[PDB]
Amino acid sequence: QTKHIAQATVKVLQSYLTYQAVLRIQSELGETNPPQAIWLNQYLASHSIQNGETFLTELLDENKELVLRILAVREDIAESVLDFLPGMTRNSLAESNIAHRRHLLERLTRTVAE
Amino acid sequence: QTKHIAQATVKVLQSYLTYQAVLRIQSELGETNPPQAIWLNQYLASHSIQNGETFLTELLDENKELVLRILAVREDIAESVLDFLPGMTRNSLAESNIAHRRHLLERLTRTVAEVDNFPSETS
């Protein structure tokens, strides 16, 4: 179970970083080469980015340059971010738990107080 | 920008982990309380879990105990997995580069044949 969930989570994470990389590049092209910026937007409109790898594999047959730029920027994002995720996520989980627990108590308290 | 991307990535992970927790819980209910297992399943079908936080918040109105069960199991899964993600993601990224590089080489190979046989594609 654990291994399989970890692997599944890594795919989701990588795909999210792929999308994050695509946004950065939408920006960059939104100055440099608007002809390619408009093209990328149209490409996104009809090609899902939910599976980053499938998205990249099909793009590579259509615009290899974009894919390489996406791969490079995704590397920069990954490296700037990966090592913070365990801690930041633990902090967010702890805060989530305290919040739902507080809401849950407010509910029982009202529902017991009358 | 980096901090904002990290913050957003955290929300995505947290929600994914709450989805995973909901599934583990619904399977455990499968033998423990089959009526509650079909109920959770149907609740999942009609309520989006793409934001795990609002999912849990709405669930509170229907079942307080279940929310806590989901939170606790979500912690189990997170602790079992979080520390592996940096390393495994780097491996997965290296593996993606190998696959795309291979694919680029396959395109290059086809272009060399087009050049060698110009304007024909092969032979």
From Swiss-Prot, chain B:
Q: Which SUPFAM superfamilies match?
A: RbcX-like (SSF158615)
Keywords attached to this Swiss-Prot or TrEMBL record, sorted alphabetically, are:
Bacterial microcompartment, Carbon dioxide fixation, Carboxysome, Chaperone, Cytoplasm, Photosynthesis
The reply to whether Chaperone figures as a keyword in the UniProt entry is yes
**GO CC annotation terms, alphabetical:** carboxysome; cytoplasm
Q: Is Coiled coil tagged as a keyword?
A: no
Could you say which protein family the record assigns here? Answer: Belongs to the RbcX family.
* Annotated function: An RbcL-specific chaperone. The central cleft of the RbcX homodimer (RbcX2) binds the C-terminus of an RbcL monomer, stabilizing the C-terminus and probably preventing its reassociation with chaperonin GroEL-ES. At the same time the peripheral region of RbcX2 binds a second RbcL monomer, bridging the RbcL homodimers in the correct orientation. The RbcX2(2)-bound RbcL dimers then assemble into the RbcL8 core (RbcL8-(RbcX2)8). RbcS binding triggers the release of RbcX2.
What protein does this entry describe?
RuBisCO chaperone RbcX
Please name the source species. Synechocystis sp. (strain ATCC 27184 / PCC 6803 / Kazusa)
Q: Which gene encodes it?
A: rbcX
